[PDB]
Protein: DNA polymerase eta
Amino acid sequence: MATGQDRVVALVDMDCFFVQVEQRQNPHLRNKPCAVVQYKSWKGGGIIAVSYEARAFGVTRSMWADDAKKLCPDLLLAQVRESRGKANLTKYREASVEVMEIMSRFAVIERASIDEAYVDLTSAVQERLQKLQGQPISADLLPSTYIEGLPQGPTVQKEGMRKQGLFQWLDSLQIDNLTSPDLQLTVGAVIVEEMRAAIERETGFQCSAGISHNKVLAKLACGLNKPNRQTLVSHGSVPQLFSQMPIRKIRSLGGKLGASVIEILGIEYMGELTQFTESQLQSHFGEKNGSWLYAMCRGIEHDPVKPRQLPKTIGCSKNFPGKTALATREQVQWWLLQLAQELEERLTKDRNDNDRVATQLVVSIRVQGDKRLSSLRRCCALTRYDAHKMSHDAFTVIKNCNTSGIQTEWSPPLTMLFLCATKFSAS
DNA sequence: ATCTCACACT
DNA sequence: AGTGTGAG
Ligand SMILES: Nc1ccn([C@H]2C[C@H](O)[C@@H](COP(=O)(O)NP(=O)(O)OP(=O)(O)O)O2)c(=O)n1
Ligand SMILES: [Mg+2]
Ligand SMILES: [Mg+2]
Structure:
């Protein structure tokens, strides 16, 4: 049977990313409790990134800054730039590009968010395993690596635990066997140290990293020892790792599916899924899910690292909650034109940098009284990077959503506007 | 109401 | 084509 040990995969995720970006530009904020907010004049603004000094006081994402200062009175704040009446994340997108290009020097990268990327190191490990003869792997090659599940068997501080575990790992390493999966992950972890040293040297940003045999495990491993540390999760660490791992913490199980696994099967931890046959899991959750759950609770997962460093979509949105929803026709025209103008400058930059053009425009709205994130999506042809054409066209395809008999009145008031360029192709 | 992106289902 | 889910 195939033990899900064919690959070496890392996930690298920046530490409190938006905060690091502001702290590098504004040294006043380094090594202090700070957070990043947007739109300051409602409850100090909503918090979108929290530094680790501020997390020690309880400050979280999604809190209002005014409530955040209640937990942490010395908290310093940085506010997202605002342009055309809405958030502008250019600074963070450009800092993201810095990190992704560096990681792209080492292996194939799958950009998975603005601050993290999966790395398929299988080939780079095979290559490294031949350039280093058969010589041992010194602990000095892994100065920030944790071996999950170690130390074991017959120090009271965290670095002491780290070293002892690493020591036990390396001492037990079969450097004889170029094919041993634990050796492979170790070499992968040496490379990830270098990758993270380069990221920090060249950008000033610290980050953490998971190393394992698949994307789900590498991501789990990444969070085990955040910040500024990397974690190797061997296939053999999985049974004890999963035996008390809440199901909701595994990637793609944090929502409705993970809740129904918990409710239907009557279990709390990943490891309890092993009691069920694959056909049982498939009866409850479908053939693809039951099969994915059957393999995943044994540490096995085959989703590949997609070679993709570039977004497939480029989107633009503003929500208009509560009293602020839009009820004029020309109010809806104006905000569409604001969204299309940011879209145009981002699309122009993308065409110049990446040699591709978006060919479809996706317009989406919500209306007060609805429930879900979106209430209505419609598409149209994107033939010119012209903000006025994009907004006019986007209006045309939604203007019948206006149930109002009136001319200039628009309602159910629009709680949300979303424009998204997509279906790119080479140019 | 703290703006984004990917993907499966149909 | 359009909806729903999951995520950072
Ligand atoms: N819901 C979210 C999640 C993240 N983000 C932005 C700001 C985050 O700093 C950046 C990366 O998100 P994140 O990786 O989930 N956690 P972030 O790096 O702050 O902190 P760590 O927990 O990763 O150290 O995405 C956001 O704007 N809205
Ligand atoms: Mg992060
Ligand atoms: Mg992240």
In short: Chain A has 14 helices and 16 strands. Residues 13, 17, 61, 112-116, 251-257, 372-374, 376-379 of chain A lie near DNA strand C (CB under 10 Å from a C1').
